[PDB]
Structure 1
């Protein structure tokens, strides 16, 4: 048996890149149902008390949430295990600090403060662009936000500045060659780079040849490429650890050099 879906998830069976411990706790937070899939999510708790360390109990975490000092995507949340994802902005209204989640090329979720100007909008790639019922068109973004009456020239894999004050499309950026991308998941996790060429194969799975800033060339599936804006025109800054790609030797040299040299 198995008479229905689990409402629990054990630790030491949760995805590595959330940066939880091994067996020292027997249960992981587990994301709630929401706009993103649970593998790629980062439960609010892990950000709040394991990275920003504002709680040393679970009792505190609930009490923090009930204050409602936390908006996520401009809207007022109170969920203890909110399923935030890629380019989801967290807005602390008590301190005026806006943090966004973007991958390190190490593969660890970055604590990446952004200005409240850049926390007005986020760039969301279209997943489907849908001729809906009664001939009204809609675009649907990756984060499951359906915006009606969208711009009437858009096509698949375009990005779309969604605004979080007022909802809706606030222009768009057209998908073209050489656009900035962050390649997410896989062995190419958290790398940034242009395009170069998108190879098309009829039937399932189309691969996109990416060249990164360093000049290392690799392919991944189209699914694993996320378009984050226009070529050589960032809209949010690079995170820690380069965010490009760095070798284990170089990384060791940074780790030893910076440590016992601060303070």
Structure 2
């Protein structure tokens, strides 16, 4: 009978969103708690070793990470267990490389190369709102982060809008609302990695979540959950997507 928390992960029990050989070895790296969920993230060791190929062994990868060479959201990360997730930027200045982390049409995480100018912005979806002592407004975002705003501009933010920010200093830019002609990118579900414009929203009683209808870029309609719709623009995306 287990008497405490887990500290190990077997490869056959790893999440499907990863690109990992399951029958090669017995153990996998167990991610440490952090910004994103376990089903929507992946550690840095795998990005450095198995995705880009800058190393063949975990010792080399750990040396690279501890020398202060990899940035995430503009910050040096040395922990090989740190999880990287959707809409995150991975940058390497000694090679001028910049990648955005996104999902496939299967649900697996890939790196899409971007430019050094767009690598300075990250969109954050608002997941919740709170009042904190002193009468301040706290927005709780999708990566698990938090942001403070004043009481006077509380109506300019809601629980499904998107906020674009300069990532190392975290200053707000270009709020994008949830409306009936907004452009959205789907992150989870069966229609993952699709994009389109909103058409209709539907509410339901007693806990059942709301639903949203979307029109494809060629005329086809589909549906999904309003929590899986990530606003990225008004009529034209504001980041380079695949």
What TM-score comes out, normalization by structure 1 length? Answer: 0.85
How far, CA to CA, are the matches of 2:36 and 2:106 in structure 1?
22
Q: What SS class does the counterpart of residue 69 from structure 1 fall into? A: coil
Instruction: Tell me the residue number matched to 1:90.
Output: 90
Q: What SS class does the counterpart of residue 203 from structure 2 fall into? A: coil
Instruction: Tell me the residue number matched to 2:210.
Output: 206
Which runs of at least 4 in structure 1 moved beyond 3 Å after TM superposition? none
How far, CA to CA, are the matches of 1:235 and 1:45 in structure 2?
30
Identify the match of residue 235 of structure 2 among 223, 232, 236: 232
Instruction: Tell me the residue number matched to 1:216.
Output: 220
The CA deviation at 1:106 is: 3.9
Q: What is the CA deviation profile of residues 212-231 of structure 1, one whole-angstrom value per residue up to 9, with x for unaligned ones?
A: 2243322222222222x223
Q: Which moved more, 1:198-207 or 1:79-88?
A: 198-207
How far, CA to CA, are the matches of 2:26 and 2:188 in structure 1?
26
Instruction: Tell me the residue number matched to 1:194.
Output: 197
What TM-score comes out, normalization by structure 2 length? Answer: 0.92
How far, CA to CA, are the matches of 1:26 and 1:15 in structure 2?
15
Contact 1:97 1:113 survives alignment (8 Å) = yes
Q: What SS class does the counterpart of residue 110 from structure 1 fall into? A: strand
Q: Which moved more, 1:156-165 or 1:169-178?
A: 169-178
Which has the larger share of strand?
2
Q: What SS class does the counterpart of residue 18 from structure 1 fall into? A: coil
Instruction: Tell me the residue number matched to 1:174.
Output: 177
**Cα separation, partners in 2 of 1:22 and 1:97, compared to 1, 3 Å:** same
Contact 1:44 1:81 survives alignment (8 Å) = yes
Contact 1:98 1:119 survives alignment (8 Å) = yes
Instruction: Tell me the residue number matched to 1:57.
Output: 57
Instruction: Tell me the residue number matched to 1:261.
Output: none
Contact 1:147 1:169 survives alignment (8 Å) = no
Please, which runs of 5 or more residues in structure 1 have no aligned partner?
240-263
Q: What SS class does the counterpart of residue 194 from structure 1 fall into? A: strand
Contact 1:118 1:235 survives alignment (8 Å) = no
Q: How many residues align?
A: 238
